[PDB]
């Protein structure tokens, strides 16, 4: 039985993957495939890749100790996007919008 706080995190994760946010969540569904995207410097710049499917697997495997560890992975995902891509890139605009959704509901932690 997940703790109350980790149940809240699982709900956040379900919302982030839902159709309601799919227009800006889609770049974060799967690990960045640097070779497929021609981003041949991605893994020289990003040392710890993260994506929503990895967060989902770690939640299902009970990897996360607490809500703080879950939130660190979600924020690592956004930070990687801000680090690698130029600030005017469309994916950065999508990252900002998905992070806005995350931060406001994470703040409602019970």
Ligand X SMILES: CC(=O)N1CCc2c(sc3nc(SCC(=O)Nc4cccnc4C)n(Cc4ccco4)c(=O)c23)C1
Using CA atoms, how far apart are residues 38 and 30, in angstroms rounded to an integer?
A: 16
Using CA atoms, how far apart are residues 93 and 85, in angstroms rounded to an integer?
A: 11
Residues 39-68 touching ligand X, rule: CB under 6 A, are: none
Residue closer to ligand X, measured from CB, 28 or 64: 28
Is residue 85 part of the contact set for ligand X (CB under 6 A)? yes
Is residue 84 part of the contact set for ligand X (CB under 6 A)? yes
Query: Which residue of 41, 69, 90, 103 would you call a contact of ligand X, by CB under 6 A?
Result: 90
Query: Which residue of 81, 98, 99, 102 would you call a contact of ligand X, by CB under 6 A?
Result: 81
CB of 27 to ligand X, least distance (A): 4
31-53: b (≥16 Cβ within 10 Å) or e: ebebeeeeeeebeeebeeebbbe
- Which residue, among 5, 92, 85, has the nearest Cα to 13 in the 3D structure? 5
Residue 14 burial by CB count (10 A; 0-12/13-18/19+): exposed, middle or buried? Answer: exposed
CB of 106 to ligand X, least distance (A): 19
Residue closer to ligand X, measured from CB, 33 or 44: 33
With contacts defined by CB under 6 A, name the span among 6-14, 15-23, 59-67, 81-89 that binds ligand X.
81-89
């Amino acid at each position: 039985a997940l703790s109350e706080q980790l149940k809240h995190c699982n709900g956040i994760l379900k919302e982030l993957l839902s159709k309601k946010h799919a227009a800006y969540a889609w770049p974060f569904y799967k690990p960045v495939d640097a070779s497929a995207l021609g981003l041949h410097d991605y893994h020289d710049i990003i040392k710890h890749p993260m994506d929503l499917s990895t967060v989902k697997r770690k939640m299902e495997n009970r990897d996360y100790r607490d809500a703080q560890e879950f939130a660190a992975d979600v924020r690592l995902m956004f930070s990687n996007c801000y680090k690698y891509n130029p600030p005017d890139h469309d994916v950065v605009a999508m990252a900002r919008k998905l992070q806005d959704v995350f931060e406001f509901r994470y703040a409602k932690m019970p």
